[PDB]
Amino acid sequence: MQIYEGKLTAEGLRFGIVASRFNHALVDRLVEGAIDCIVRHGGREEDITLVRVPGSWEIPVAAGELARKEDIDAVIAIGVLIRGATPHFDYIASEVSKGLANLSLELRKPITFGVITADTLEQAIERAGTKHGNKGWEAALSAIEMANLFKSL
Amino acid sequence: MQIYEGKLTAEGLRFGIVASRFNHALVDRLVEGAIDCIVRHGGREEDITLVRVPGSWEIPVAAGELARKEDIDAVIAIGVLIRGATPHFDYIASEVSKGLANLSLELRKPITFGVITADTLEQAIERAGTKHGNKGWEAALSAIEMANLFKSL
Amino acid sequence: MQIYEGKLTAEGLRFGIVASRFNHALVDRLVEGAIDCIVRHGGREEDITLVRVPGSWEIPVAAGELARKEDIDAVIAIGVLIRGATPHFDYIASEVSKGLANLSLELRKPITFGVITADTLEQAIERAGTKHGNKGWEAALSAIEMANLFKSL
Amino acid sequence: MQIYEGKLTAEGLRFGIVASRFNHALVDRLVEGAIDCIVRHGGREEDITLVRVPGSWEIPVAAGELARKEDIDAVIAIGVLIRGATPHFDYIASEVSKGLANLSLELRKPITFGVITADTLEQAIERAGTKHGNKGWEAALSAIEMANLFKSL
Amino acid sequence: MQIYEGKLTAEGLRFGIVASRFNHALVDRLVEGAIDCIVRHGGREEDITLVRVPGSWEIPVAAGELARKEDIDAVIAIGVLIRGATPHFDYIASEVSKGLANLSLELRKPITFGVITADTLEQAIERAGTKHGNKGWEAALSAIEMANLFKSL
Amino acid sequence: MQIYEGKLTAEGLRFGIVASRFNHALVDRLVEGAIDCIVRHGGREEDITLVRVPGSWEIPVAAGELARKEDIDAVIAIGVLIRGATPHFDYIASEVSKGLANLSLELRKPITFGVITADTLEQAIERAGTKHGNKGWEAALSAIEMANLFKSL
Amino acid sequence: MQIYEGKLTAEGLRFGIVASRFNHALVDRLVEGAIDCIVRHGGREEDITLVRVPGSWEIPVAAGELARKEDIDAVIAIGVLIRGATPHFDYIASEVSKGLANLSLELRKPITFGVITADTLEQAIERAGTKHGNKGWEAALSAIEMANLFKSL
């Protein structure tokens, strides 16, 4: 049986990060987490491209631009959505997830999902570098593995 | 690390606004907000194109026409949906959000989401220039940032 | 500021109507409403093409055929869905709305949504020419405005 | 006014049926119903192609193959989904409906929806040839009408 | 009618920020927000003076020193007060607000109020770069507008 | 960006303390705390001036006298108010806080607020050298920082 | 400021694992997790020594033997304790944790704690490669970081 898997070393890999600015007190923790993951797994900070966008709605169109670059091996999408009083959250979360998933398939390049979709502020804090870990770190680790997998093929 | 971001100056930028007429007592406040944002950030009113459509359902097909214009840097979609008695709201909100998101990716051009999707009339009033701000102003600010980002690249 | 809008005169405009037969006691009121709107706004009955399909599920594939005709300026989709005992309603309503929205964007031609999606029979009667108006009339008015807008461009 | 409609005679029409095997005690009643409808409306049993697939998930990819055949006028999709204990039902029902709807538009050929999506076993029995009729018969009747409509054009 | 208003460009403007150290995990987010606002609206980071004081009580006397500088166009006061168990919060909040308001009138120079006065820790987190925005960003935007207004006169 | 801050060394600094005698069993702990803070941060006990007044009402007029001395760098106001049965507490607390805040601005000299305003005796004990620290120590630390800041300017 | 940290590459590192046999259906998942972590971070499976002991009580005395080996850089202790009906769990959990902590300090070598101490079977399953991750993987990652840190010094 032929087995393909990605290792977790980031030596030589080039990453794009697209990070939204809304809820920046939490998003900044996710970006720190993603960068720390890449560097301590052997990636170069110089090989990271970071794109900032205003809100999660804008992540896919920016991710589309990064994922089309030949010198980017994987894109990490980072943002924080917290449900408010209206149905707005539902529509944004659906379109951000759908757009990133569709781009990955269209461009045949890994795009990992480091977007917190929380019902409450507490849940978002828990997942941005406190008790339930750091979703930016997790999305970076997924991107390292997938970039390595795609090299193997 | 390469960082790309958009500044908030609108000098030289050209914008399209697509605004639905339904719930016009509120939509007109969102359009006022978007225009005020553009002008006080240094954009020219002469560089704004405004398209009026009957309802939110028609926003995407009109946005498609504006976003295909070479002299438009970003499109701001503006409308107000308020849940009624039937499931109708759900289907309209889903298709408007999906269509705008898909167009942005297909055309590789920022389209920002200034459509209120409210459960109640009060929630819509709150987001159309009262206690929870002005979603038209917010969508214009997002469009300025994204137009600048896309120039940087 | 450049402003584009559609007027509400239907002189010279050519329309397609796709109407489902299920719930025909109500759909026939919506079709009457759409035709009345077109004619009293100055359209010619001779410039209307009406396509009948069995149920709402079949509206998009028929609308696709009409919207591809060069001599059709706008398509009005008409039907009535009323929730039954199973989840069936949800799947049909989602696909009909998604298909019409997608066709409008693909073909760059207005397709208006005159499909009632009701939780109860009473709600459907209310929207088919009684206390909450006539959704066929409303969809025709939207189609007149959009056809005029698209001429202006 | 130009009116296009399909009659309910099946003389000369060729049909594909794609039927899932899961819940076969009920699906077999739907297939019987579809075939009976075609034959007693004047279709030839020899002009029916039946494709069996394991579950509803597999209906769209098989329907894609049949609907691409030049000698097939319409495809009838037949299956039975009954909600279980997990969210699984929701994901399968959504993808089966979305896939069939998308295929019909892409291939410009009628594909009718004879898939029961039931919350309970009783609801499925009711719609597979007992008190609420036979959804296979209904989907075949819809396919006859649409095949005739598409000839008219 | 003579209309005076401030635009939102910060080119050439010089700002003072007075920021308290108490609740620094949140105040540091407000200061980041204020600086980001100034810079992305075209201000120079070199034209910002930041004064740190121990607690909100000390903000006015420090703001008095900055607002008396001829090369400062506007002062942004930043701090976070969260109600504790005693009446202490009431007395501090009253004196900080009164002192800043009085200084602005005495010196005829804009001083904007970026001090969170929260009943709970959650409310303060919400307003320091999470779900209810960033009060430091808001106070900086107000200071840009007022500095521009005062130039116009 | 120009940053001004005060360090926490008290070498060379001269302080005034104004301490009320009412609730002296607790005020004496606050005065001990303030003096300990100054001395262990490097201040000389010989450089402290202590003024005793009968009650918190009299603190501002005495603080006015100390803060006008050229050889005083900062004044620490110390007292304990505990709510009694009447509205009296409210009026005293308001005037003491208002007077100290106003004096600091008028004289452009730091005056720090080491006055406990407690609803209960227990709350006052907690803040006078037990479980919630020592407000006299805290006010002295604030005065050291502000005296150093004002030197820097 | 001198900063010491460990990277997450395991190239060249040699590890000991001590794994208890009680609750082996879960412990075997933790051991799989630890080994997978080491290998995909670049460690050699040949550089792992695995010691099996009967129960968690016996982990420290075996860990003592491994941690005294000059060719072992870090020890990973793996086991699963689930509270039963008596106080037994408390005494075992206390002694296993105390013994491992004491050994690490005595031998000045990292020993990481991959022992689940669960109140219920469900909690243990959650932490042995299901919804709350894999504590063996986590303990191995900690051991890689600490082995690298200790090299740096």
Numbering used by the authors:
A (entry chain A), B (entry chain A), C (entry chain A), D (entry chain A), E (entry chain A), F (entry chain A), ...: 1 to 153
Paper's wording?
Using state-of-the-art microscope and detector hardware as well as the latest software techniques to overcome microscope and sample limitations, a 1.42 Å map of Aquifex aeolicus lumazine synthase (AaLS) was obtained from a 48 h microscope session. The final 3D reconstruction of AaLS consisted of 470 878 particles. This 1.43 Å map was slightly improved by Ewald sphere correction to 1.42 Å [Figs. 2(a), and S1(a) and S1(b) of the supporting information]. The half maps from Ewald sphere correction were subsequently used for atomic model refinement using the 1.60 Å crystal structure of AaLS as a starting model. A mask-normalized Fo − Fc-generated difference map was then used to identify peaks within 0.5 Å of hydrogen atoms in a reduced model, followed by manual curation which resulted in 552 hydrogens. Thus, we were able to identify ∼46% of all putative protein hydrogen atoms from the map of AaLS at this resolution [Figs. 2(b) and 2(c)]. About 70% of hydrogen atoms could be located in maps at 1.19 and 1.25 Å resolution compared with only ∼17% at 1.84 Å resolution. Several of the water molecules identified displayed hydrogen densities adjacent to the central oxygen atom [Fig. 2(d)]. Finally, we observed the density for a tetrahedral-shaped ligand. This was built as a phosphate ion and is consistent as a bi-product of lumazine synthesis and in proximity to Arginine 127, a highly conserved residue in this family of proteins [Fig. 2(e)]. At pH 7.5 the phosphate ion is expected to be mostly in the HPO4−2 proton­ation state, though we did not observe positive density for any hydrogens. The structure we obtained from a 48 h session at 1.42 Å is to date the only sub-1.5 Å structure of a complex other than apoferritin.
In this study, we used the enzyme involved in the penultimate step of riboflavin biosynthesis as a test specimen to benchmark a recently installed microscope and determine if other protein complexes could reach a resolution of 1.5 Å or better, which so far has only been achieved for the iron carrier ferritin. Of these, AaLS from the hyper-thermophilic bacterium Aquifex aeolicus forms a 1 MDa spherical capsid of 60 identical subunits with icosahedral symmetry.
